[PDB]
């Protein structure tokens, strides 16, 4: 229907926006709604439980408490059991992957992907194919996500078309597939019109995947560019760790120094994807030289 | 070892692709095989930068959801599936790192010098490359690299001496002399031995050093010095002390113990480097980039694909 702004907003990153086009509707006590708002607020740090009456509004209580201290209890608990709505679950599958129960995660979208609301559904087929590409499989993301297409029609398409598109892009981003066509203008275009740190980072991605150290340079300098790192601290605040995450590797390139100076930051900082690799294979090399005495 | 990764290491073999693809142990064993790496310890960063060089995370939606990893491959969409290999930075930053060596060499600063050329020895030994000529560079690269390590680890053995050991002191600022560097740095070890054999009416070796730099060097403040030490030294064929030291003749110096290896000599060499020591020093590591065993055998640094 048509809150296609809301969401062409959430999914570019900007929530300064995707906040102000749900405004545009007096509390017409809509899932899709709630989901959103509750969802775009706590993107602007400015999360406010929106009501505990809600079996729904009340889950998202129930997650955002959840991600202030890794219990799933009474979120996993107040679900069991209960046939829920895909939102209600998306919300689950977040937890339980954000925990590391990657393969329960698939399942818990998988399991309502398949079932009754009309509403919610497209919002899982993205997250079940993130999942599936966390937990590094490729395919079963591929299936998850042709299943869904060459079946669903014109209508889902509609409103969901960009919710799909960036599916699709996940999946040629690790597939590496058409990452310099096709993929390329995807991410070129939305950063040209809707510069985010989402867009733009994912640009930069695109550059790093290329070999473009050269544009990729300018894409990160302009990063720093008080446009984003000041005139725009909210939302940029959010993205920090995988953008020195983003700047180790282009230093990499570059044969930069900077690969401990700057994962300094992200270390003393975050605990993610990036230092859970370099640990990881840190060890994995002390390991070897204890081995060899 | 993943859809991609399996790629990688199905399409080769080679080090630098087994420690992208996160096979370090594989990695290991075959630079053991092929260099005689044995000591591993500096060479961490270099498994370390391949791997994380060539990963890439572009954030996921949900924000506080893990980040996704992406690939970054050598090659365009353009290329045989066969030839699917990971990004490894070749040899524009071999030479970065040659000249930052150059420059700490006019500098004055050995240790910072030497702590660079060692550097680009370990990228040249887990380096990827696809043309012949890069791959016949690489090694042109890693000759010049040893040489400038051997040269300075023996100029710097000199400073490293007590008053009393001028016999060795004298010895030592003249093979300085013999380090296959290029001739605008070779000055500086012609000036330095030029200048002992003075010093200590040597002026037998004091001309000829002199002289062998004011070939390289028409005029300026420091090529002014080399004449007017070469004629008062030039006048008195002098032999003050005689040292161990042949210039009309062919030998290597060993980078262990700093005497030359004549022609007969036995020697041993260090399978990656290169570098010749005495039979002394077989079975132990190199000191041009303590990694290598000498003397172990290996079937050569591969380096292409």
Known sequence: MDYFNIKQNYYTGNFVQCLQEIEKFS?????????????????????????????????????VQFLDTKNIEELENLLKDKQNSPYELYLLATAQAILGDLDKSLETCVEGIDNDEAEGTTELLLLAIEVALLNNNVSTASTIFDN?????????????????????????????????????????????????WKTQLGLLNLHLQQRNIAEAQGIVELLLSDYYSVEQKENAVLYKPTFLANQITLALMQGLDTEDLTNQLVKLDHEHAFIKHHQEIDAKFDELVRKYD | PHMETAIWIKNSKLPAVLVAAGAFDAAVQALSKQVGVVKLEPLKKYFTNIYEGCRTYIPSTPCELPAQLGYVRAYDDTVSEDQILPYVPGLDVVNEKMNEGYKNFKLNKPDIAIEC??????????????????????????????????????????????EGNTV???????????????????????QVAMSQHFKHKNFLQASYFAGEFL?????????????????KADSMASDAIPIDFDPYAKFDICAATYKPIYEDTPSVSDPLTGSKYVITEKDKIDRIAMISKIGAPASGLRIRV
Do not use: C, W
């Not at chain 1, 775009?40 to 509004?57: E, F, M, N, R, V």
């Not at chain 2, 390289?216 to 004629?231: D, F, M």
């Open chain 1, 148 to 196: 869904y297409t060459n079946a669903i029609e014109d209508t889902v398409s509609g409103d969901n078309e960009m919710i799909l598109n960036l599916a699709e892009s996940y999946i040629k981003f690790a597939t590496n597939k058409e990452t310099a066509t096709s993929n390329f203008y995807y991410y070129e275009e939305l950063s040209q019109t809707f510069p985010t």
């Open chain 2, 168 to 190: 060795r002191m004298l010895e030592l600022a003249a093979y300085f002399t013999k380090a296959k560097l290029s001739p605008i740095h070779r000055t500086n070890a012609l």
């Open chain 2, 117 to 162: 050329f060692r550097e680009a020895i370990y990228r040249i030994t887990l380096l990827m490359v696809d043309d012949a000529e890069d791959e016949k560079l690489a090694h042109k690269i890693l000759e010049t690299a040893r040489e400038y390590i051997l040269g300075l680890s023996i100029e710097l053995e000199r400073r490293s001496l007590k």
């Open chain 1, 27 to 63: 509390k017409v006590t809509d899932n899709t709604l709630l989901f959103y708002k509750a969802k775009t607020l706590l993107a602007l740090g400015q999360y406010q439980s929106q009501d505990p009456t809600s079996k729904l509004g009340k889950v998202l209580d129930l997650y």
């Open chain 2, 215 to 231: 070939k390289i060097i028409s005029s300026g403040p420091r090529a002014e010095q080399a004449r007017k030490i070469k004629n």
